[PDB]
Amino acid sequence: MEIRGIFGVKVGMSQVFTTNNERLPITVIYCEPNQVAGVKTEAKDKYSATLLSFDTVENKKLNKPQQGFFEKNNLKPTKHLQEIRNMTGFEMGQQITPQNLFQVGEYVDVSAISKGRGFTGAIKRWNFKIGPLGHGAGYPHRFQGSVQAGRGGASAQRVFKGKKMSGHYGHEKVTVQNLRIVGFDEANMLVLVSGAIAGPEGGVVLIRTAKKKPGVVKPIELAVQTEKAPE
Amino acid sequence: KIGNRTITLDPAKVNLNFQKDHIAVKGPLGQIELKLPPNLPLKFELKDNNLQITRNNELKQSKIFHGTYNALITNAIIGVTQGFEKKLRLVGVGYRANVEGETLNLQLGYSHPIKEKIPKGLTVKVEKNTEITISGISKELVGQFATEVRKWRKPEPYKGKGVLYFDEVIVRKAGK
């Protein structure tokens, strides 16, 4: 469908009080003006997408093939390159900011790389149960769980593919859907998104139109303090 | 038998163009198009005011087709010349229907409003709120409209409530 996308860097999390008396936790995203580096058409390519360039850097910090591509396409040198599917309607070499893409309070989804956690066990990874601690116990306390499917020639006699055991956890792309944009800051190029965004502070973040609610925009307005300085 | 049944038609306004697999019938009303499936085991002949369908063999499907398409030609000619009509008696305590533009809307007993789109070539009229008349030139299409209107409220056996067919009797039950 008509999917709109922007790229930014998560800077932290705060809260804002809103009218209708709710305290909304928010995530703050620093969104640089993104530059459309390429447009790929359905007829000529067999699919349609828009590839932008963001996180600009000096020319001495870029490799020779990438800087050659940037100077051939007449673009600002940037070290980050990525595309979104089904993004159409933007001319090549046009600066795009989230203000032109999304509305004040529309629903969007956010994709980001999860915080790395390393080699984790079965319980921390698959929400498994821990074995009993008292009344007598054994060496394996944080046991993964018996992986027996069948013992004997008439049964599996093997661990089934895709078993739930210990392994790498974190540093993986994850998407959280139906997050309402709260506010735009043109001067600071700063987007406010309700809820919690995955990834460490300073990581890359992709804001896309929500596929569950594409056109739904739920109103949200902030509260103006009525206080007065001392009388 | 239907296959060896005369189809005497007057040449006043009804003509029947017989192509390879596209039979066209034109008359007082709109034109009806019939598709002939490939390798049809039955040849038509077009004399003066008389069409006769003959077959080549004694196959089971041959006999079935010979009867079926004689009936189809009869139905097409009748609909082209005089059309088909169906009558629905929508009866109940607060049941009523009416026609707005191309959509027929009904309010039987449902919180959500009920609307229904009318296909091309069929005209549905509502003289009285409890009465519906579906007039068309193709029997199967008017029948489909009648049954899809009926599906909203099938006649229950305990009382008379429902979208009944005309001169249609239902078995009565006494729910004390």
């Binding site: 809260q15 009080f17 008396n21 709710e22 305290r23 | -």
Partner: protein, 122 residues
């Protein structure tokens, strides 16, 4: 968060000094009961001049919690003891008075009689 087999106090006039939780009513494996939740209980410490007798299984609604809960504006309400009052099918209190303060989460889940018979709502 009052849970299964939790002893709590009754804040009404009914003769029941200590009451024990039996089931967190409402669904399957409902782990906890927060403010405004209804539970099935058994009277364990009672008095001679009381409407209820020791051992009866009854239905109650919780009004206070030591753990507390957080509202939408961000205020965290926290009492110092878990308390419940005995209610009837109609959601009407069994006692004629309510002792101490009660939460406002009752207001959301009906329980208008409980609020009107309380000393002060919080």
């Amino acid at each position: 968060m009052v849970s299964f087999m939790t002893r709590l106090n009754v804040a009404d006039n009914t003769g029941a000094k200590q009451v024990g939780i039996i089931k967190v009513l409402g669904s399957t494996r409902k782990r906890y009961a927060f403010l405004g939740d209804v539970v099935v209980v058994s009277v364990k410490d009672a008095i001679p001049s009381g409407m209820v007798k020791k051992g009866q299984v009854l239905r109650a609604v919780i009004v206070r919690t030591k753990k507390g809960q957080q509202r939408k504006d961000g205020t965290h309400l926290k009492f110092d003891d878990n308390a419940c009052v005995l209610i009837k099918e109609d959601k009407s209190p069994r006692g004629t008075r309510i002792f101490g303060p009660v939460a406002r989460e009752l207001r959301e889940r009906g329980y208008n009689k409980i609020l009107s018979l309380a000393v002060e709502v919080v």
